Symmetry: D2
Subunit: 245 residues, 4 copies
């Protein structure tokens, strides 16, 4: 698959994370413009240098929980490239916190980043969305299988699935809204939990391996591409068969 | 059918609402103890009086979005009845708000009541949950069909479905955690045509499914959210 | 719950099975009339005798894959009790058969019993169904999780879920059509199963019957088209 | 959208149908070898000529309901191209038949073509499937929404969804098994339905249009491509938002 994104503009939050980096690389290689935001301004700027074509790249330090940063992100997209073709709210946190130990602060921090932030970005982006544009949300296996020790994480990822359906109705026919639901992907997000459970996870997985960040990115690219022109409201499971939904 | 909830205690938020009253009514008729909360104390107290078994009913003014009121709600259940058998976080708001017009305040108010509040009640309730207890969440057709002009509402009701699955895992085997997803509960003609059962649902038809999930008839059901919508949508 | 099924009639195939017997026992204890069918006539009659209200029980030898036996089953319900309130096509086979080893006969046998048979029973039952009646199909965890070595079985139980939705539309508002999808029912790999099951036990057949009874009852009067997972949380669908 | 399928072999039943033709065109344009089957061989060969790189196309008259024709189809793929990379059992029938009027013959006809035939093709294909191969089934909106007057059709398409999950477990990791669930597609299958129901369908569809056959083919191609390399067991809704599943 080869994506033709020349002169199409991607806004991607959490761009320095494992899946975020894979998304940026694939879209950049496909000729797209990138507006990358992240809470870690130093890593993002350094990472962007390696992908380097500054004519097609703009970066900004942005907190997913900040409504004003969503406004800055859209204004930068409008100023640099004149609009938005693809919107991907990838920024999120994954905290292991058994429910009996979950503090009110624990709960609010996960909802603010994983859910409120997605609202802020989608809402501020509306005037900048172009014809044939795409929003792609990031759900998770946990929304479908049920989180083991992360009821707040699971809640926000179930919210992603339904929010995708709602916005798919409201922004049609101009904009399509879809999602990707990753399974177990090897990134720093999962590194500590997964180091003693790699064999167990592969044994449970029909494809017998962990997912790669690029295998999430390629599905996001598909959903943004003309190959998905009649797909809207839909969240796709990308988990090697570890779970059937 | 017929439920035997004698000496078992229901905690119900938003108890003065349409579905809320139906739930309180059924569980009360079933012999249960009731701890009812609502933002409208006066309306609630009048309703609770109409059921007339005051020794089995306790009411309190509680804002579903307030963690302090959740603590007071659980303490009241502990004080009057010693624990919680059924926890039903029913309180919620349904605001029609096209997404292009949705304010940050619009968004937060719906998340705070419909989602944060469910976290507060469930978390504070943990020490009070008895053996064989149930949590039953209220999802919505909108979670599955996609809301037409209520993206914040749909988000919170998709969150209920996944949060139900998460807590079912963590609170098992002592407590089962399930949900009910109501359809259209009493352009009516279009709805009748679209509904196989050709009518609107009654609040009593949501309450009876909640009671089923709380009953021993559902003893091997957990994590599950049931569609109660007359066939208007298949999920 | 306690179900009031007096003067209401259940037609149940595979009634001598583990789940089948639990359904019959519950409905009979609830006052219902029973039309029980099974391929094993002697075992069924012995079971039916134990319930002891022979005026409320009628049995017949019937092959679920036989359209003629479906016709005979409904005629028996008509003759003894005048109609059908609850139709539960419970008969099914579960064959372990890795796909690379699956014969054409293996495939056909499972489709014939688990899928063709449900069609024949539902189709022939239509004139006998009463008002406020229910059909409750039996799906399976395998339909949702994906069968490990039973692709034919899994296909038939996915068919149940979609056929339930279809008949729900067509047979409403007179009849509601729903399903129950059992998980792992005691009816080894026990350590593995307990580890994956939040409730930390196998399901009991009586716990499938009580959900079917719920779906047949007025408590489910606004539920149609719906298949309920009854699996102790082993799988979330 | 364009894919790179050179030297990979597609076996496609019902190749002369609306969606079938769109699948064949895309894969051929993408450099694949085609083994096309249909009950209407004159139609198929006439169609096969128009795409014409004829050395990369092999056609055969084959009845999906025949186990022997499935063997002949696989044998042709083996003889001409040495194996099978993509297996797409697209042949199917759609009969409007109210359940109260449905004959036993009606039932068996639909289960035989739409379900037994898929078994015959998948089972006979096993020895010929190559590394990194894909099976992609065709489900339907009817499996999820519930057919209005086609309980046998709805049953077979629900079977596709569950059979896809089962085979993804058994044929992994060598083969991924996925599905596509089309909505309302502009095709002969829907000409009769949409003569009286066109207004309602566009009203109910967020994208406010009928789907095109090519918009099913592009999603099938995605599932066969490396972009879906971590997707198995999965059936994707391609319905313009008319139904959220
Ligand atoms: N296995 C997996 O990694 C997995 C599985 C399922 C779903 N997901 C989801 O996919 C998304 C991306 O995962 P990932 O691998 O990139 O995660 P990650 O933890 O590796 O990276 C997330 C990135 O977001 C940044 N970030 C954190 N808080 C932020 C904030 N307030 N504002 C802005 N940026 C912030 C982090 O610095 C990091 O660069 C997340 O939403 C995650 O929940 C991941
Ligand atoms: N048709 C329906 O009513 C319908 C359909 C689908 C889902 N649901 C869901 O079912 C649940 C119950 O619905 P209902 O019929 O009782 O709704 P309702 O609108 O009739 O209930 C409103 C009640 O909740 C109270 N309330 C409002 N905000 C509150 C707060 N902050 N704290 C405490 N109480 C508060 C109000 O005072 C009132 O008594 C809700 O979660 C709703 O979203 C309802
Ligand atoms: N663990 C489980 O038992 C389980 C799990 C998931 C789903 N289900 C499904 O639930 C349903 C009921 O299961 P069960 O516990 O009764 O199964 P079972 O194997 O205990 O019951 C088999 C019974 O069906 C009868 N039978 C077999 N072939 C028949 C035919 N051709 N015609 C008529 N009767 C026939 C046999 O005589 C026997 O009494 C089945 O459809 C099954 O696939 C069962
Ligand atoms: N709108 C749609 O067309 C639509 C929507 C949802 C799902 N689907 C499914 O997608 C698949 C492809 O549909 P389509 O648009 O190609 O349908 P179609 O009706 O256009 O295809 C008919 C073609 O299949 C052939 N065919 C019929 N019976 C056959 C048999 N026994 N053996 C072999 N070939 C046979 C016919 O000769 C003809 O060439 C089918 O499984 C269909 O159910 C279609």
């Amino acid at each position: 698959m080869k994506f033709e994104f020349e002169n199409r503009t991607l806004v991607l939050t959490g761009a320095n994370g494992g899946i975020g980096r894979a998304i940026a690389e694939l879209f950049h290689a496909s000729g797209a413009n990138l507006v990358l935001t992240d809470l870690d301004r130093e890593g993002l700027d350094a990472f962007a240098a390696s992908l380097g074509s500054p004519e097609r790249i703009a970066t900004i330090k942005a907190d997913a929980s900040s409504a004003d940063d969503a406004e800055k992100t859209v204004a930068l997209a409008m100023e640099r490239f004149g609009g938005i073709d693809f919107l991907v709210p990838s920024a999120g946190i994954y905290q292991a916190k058994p429910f009996a130990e979950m503090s009110d602060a624990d709960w609010h921090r996960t909802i603010s980043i994983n859910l409120d932030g997605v609202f802020y970005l989608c809402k501020r982006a509306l005037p900048a969305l172009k014809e044939d544009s795409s929003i792609v949300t990031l759900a998770s296996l946990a929304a479908y299988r049920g989180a083991y020790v992360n009821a707040h994480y699971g809640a926000t990822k179930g919210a992603m699935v339904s929010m995708t359906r709602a916005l798919s109705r409201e922004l049609a026919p101009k904009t399509r809204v879809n999602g990707v639901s990753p399974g177990i992907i090897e990134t720093p997000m999962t590194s500590e939990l997964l180091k003693t459970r790699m064999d167990e996870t592969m044994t449970q997985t029909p494809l017998k391996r962990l997912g790669k960040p690029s295998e999430i990115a390629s599905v996001i690219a598909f959903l943004c591409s003309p190959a998905a022109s009649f797909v809207t409201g839909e969240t796709i499971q990308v988990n090697g068969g570890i779970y059937m939904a």
